Amino acid sequence: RSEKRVPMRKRVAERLLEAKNSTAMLTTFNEVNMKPIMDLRKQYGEAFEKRHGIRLGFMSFYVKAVVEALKRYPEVNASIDGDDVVYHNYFDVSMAVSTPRGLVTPVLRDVDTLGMADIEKKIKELAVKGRDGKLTVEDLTGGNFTITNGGVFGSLMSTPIINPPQSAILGMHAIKDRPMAVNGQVEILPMMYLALSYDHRLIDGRESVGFLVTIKELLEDPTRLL
Amino acid sequence: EKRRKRVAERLLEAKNSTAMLTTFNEVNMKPIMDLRKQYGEAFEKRHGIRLGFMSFYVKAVVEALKRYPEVNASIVVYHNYFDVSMAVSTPRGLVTPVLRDVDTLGMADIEKKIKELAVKGRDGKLTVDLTGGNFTITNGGVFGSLMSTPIINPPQSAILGMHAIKDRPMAVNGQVEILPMMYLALSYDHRLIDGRESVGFLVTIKELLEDPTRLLL
Amino acid sequence: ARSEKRVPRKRVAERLLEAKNSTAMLTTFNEVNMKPIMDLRYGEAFEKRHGIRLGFMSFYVKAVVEALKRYPEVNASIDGVVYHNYFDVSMAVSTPRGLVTPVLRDVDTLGMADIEKKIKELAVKGRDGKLTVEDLTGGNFTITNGGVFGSLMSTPIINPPQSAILGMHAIKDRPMAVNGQVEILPMMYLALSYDHRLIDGRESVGFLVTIKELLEDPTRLLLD
């Protein structure tokens, strides 16, 4: 079963394979109600735009929530080096962005110290650098966690693959209007499925689930974040 | 304690030799179900075979394959032909009868061949029909499966999993209406197929299936 | 100031890896309507007349036993295929040192209250670190509940040398289609991960559908 063959993206192939072969990868899912964030963004957005020059989007809220969650689950921010578990005192988050040569993992450094606008600007900066092929190796080295968004592609739900030597990875998805049960009443809300794939050798059930629940919580009450 | 050999090895190596991931989605079966009631009986008489869903899936899959060659490829050997393995159940387990050149078959033809293979599987008359296929369509809906993670059948790159059609309250035009929804699950070998592509492939299927009057054109 | 502190479960790490590396693990999902069981819970009476409180876990174990009896492969094991004539079910419970798999033995012979009591017994022994190795050895199947943690849906990992594992989850109110009418029901997602080298599609799905059925009609589970 072979009609045309092109010679080899073989290294990455090895990385992905070993990624899946060297870790006990599992996925835990959940859903978040984007209504609140969308409201904030509706009322404070234009103001934020002018007073900060950058536009207020969702990504900043995710990164902020993720940082908060990381601070409560150090194992998730940790890494496993052959017989040792390396914990991290810093918060560097790899952010998957798409380039014509595939996705790239630009690292957002010390995001715990960045404010909303700063994160919004840097994310932009990296997005453009990726488009122009100006992304430096410095920008692509590091990161304790990864936030990947397939919602841009229309993805409903999926199983993200861990990017070694990281322990977990969070996958954002498409925001769809969904009939939901709020107060024994059914109301349509802009729901989104979160998918966290984690290396079970380090992170366990209660923790991955806790981590994800935390994100859902903070995101459903932005005030308690922003 | 108390009291599939090669297949066991195949499945293991299948999962051990590929970076398998799964992307899910949902499709609204209402439209297809409508043509089916409106032209079905006619189709039945004028074509002798009954119009079912499977033909639409195969057709949509072929269309999708034509737009995502990597998905029709193998690890990288690309394919100029469209042979689709179709998992059918025999008393000795599931079997992968191959539907050849489905891009050239019309609705009725696919409906007949699928039948043919289904029966041959029941009678154990399926010939080593079992060799080939660039993709695989597996349907667990017959078993009542809501959603699941299909396993890739080497040396294929991806596999699509059909599921049970359940009535689900949905949001259509800021209004909630019950529609016969179905979850699609595409497991793909990430060494060859990436995110945007698997998701694209699946979105394409959803689209074509939600508008049969476009698939046929 | 910016340090990568390497702290010196490695066995467990090996187990989990080999667990995922030695089996063709796949996951099949489904949903169950908890309304009926919640209605029986007939609870206060049970409480007094049996001293223990009637919860959900007993119903799950009972349903699982029933399902096991119909799908022996799921109760089997692959040794390098050992079937089991007994029904011992590992029940994942959480201890400060992680989850533990206390085994419930011969659950097919235990009645509602008995299962309710033993589950309790084991839960406490786990809290006090009094869980014996005897309690932790054996089990043909495993029931794990992440609902306690708020988990919506997930992919459970098989505990070798077992063949499958059932994952309970959070009970959320969900708008559903009942009789062409939309009604909110306390739905729950079930996730069954199974070793495909032994258990196939029709069987895992059948097993799971069986559980859904029995659970949606407990007055076919109160006494068998």
XYZ file of C-alpha atoms in Angstrom, chain A residues 43-152:
110
model
C -17.994 46.864 29.165
C -14.322 47.583 30.029
C -12.866 46.711 26.608
C -12.865 49.967 24.634
C -11.617 51.849 27.697
C -8.868 49.270 28.230
C -8.041 49.608 24.530
C -7.446 53.344 24.688
C -5.846 53.560 28.150
C -3.574 50.604 27.372
C -3.197 50.739 23.595
C -3.683 46.970 23.304
C -6.970 45.125 22.902
C -8.409 43.086 25.777
C -8.894 39.497 24.645
C -9.402 36.098 26.289
C -5.826 34.749 26.264
C -4.713 37.123 29.020
C -7.392 35.749 31.323
C -6.325 32.180 30.554
C -2.662 32.883 31.236
C -3.582 34.668 34.462
C -5.817 31.815 35.613
C -3.154 29.287 34.650
C -0.534 31.132 36.687
C -2.857 31.132 39.693
C -3.506 27.427 39.253
C 0.205 26.708 38.883
C 0.846 28.428 42.206
C -1.544 26.014 43.894
C -0.317 22.861 42.168
C 3.524 22.953 42.074
C 3.684 19.379 40.761
C 1.940 20.609 37.605
C 4.665 23.271 37.276
C 7.319 20.636 38.027
C 9.192 18.292 35.647
C 10.551 14.759 35.883
C 14.216 14.319 35.055
C 15.039 10.635 34.986
C 14.824 9.816 38.762
C 14.248 13.313 40.108
C 11.398 15.781 40.110
C 12.496 19.318 39.341
C 10.166 21.937 40.789
C 10.152 25.508 39.460
C 10.109 28.758 41.418
C 9.366 30.738 38.243
C 6.350 30.864 35.976
C 7.276 30.548 32.308
C 4.391 29.453 30.098
C 4.868 28.083 26.572
C 2.138 29.404 24.307
C 1.494 27.437 21.123
C 1.143 29.811 18.189
C 0.864 28.817 14.519
C 3.472 29.541 11.853
C 3.362 28.396 8.188
C 5.964 25.777 9.177
C 3.680 24.410 11.893
C 2.988 25.366 15.498
C 5.683 26.937 17.650
C 6.020 27.245 21.424
C 6.966 30.879 22.196
C 7.658 31.158 25.919
C 6.031 33.879 27.998
C 8.444 34.543 30.837
C 7.605 35.473 34.407
C 3.918 35.887 33.517
C 3.200 36.115 37.241
C 4.753 39.588 37.136
C 2.980 40.740 33.959
C -0.292 42.641 34.099
C -3.251 42.198 31.728
C -2.034 44.620 29.046
C 1.552 43.317 29.226
C 0.407 39.767 28.543
C -1.856 41.051 25.787
C 1.040 42.889 24.160
C 3.644 40.124 24.472
C 1.214 37.524 23.128
C 0.690 39.801 20.127
C 4.428 40.430 19.751
C 5.100 36.680 19.629
C 2.183 36.031 17.257
C 3.624 38.483 14.728
C 7.210 37.305 15.149
C 5.865 33.842 14.344
C 4.185 35.118 11.175
C 7.383 36.847 10.017
C 9.697 33.986 10.987
C 11.463 36.340 13.401
C 10.961 34.065 16.409
C 14.342 33.569 18.080
C 15.521 30.318 19.656
C 15.655 32.284 22.910
C 11.912 32.820 22.573
C 11.445 29.112 21.910
C 13.441 27.728 24.839
C 11.843 27.030 28.194
C 8.352 26.987 29.630
C 6.999 24.875 32.487
C 3.485 24.572 31.075
C 1.793 25.010 27.691
C -1.476 26.617 26.672
C -2.700 25.488 23.279
C -5.799 26.876 21.567
C -7.501 24.885 18.830
C -10.659 26.958 19.087
C -9.206 29.115 16.323
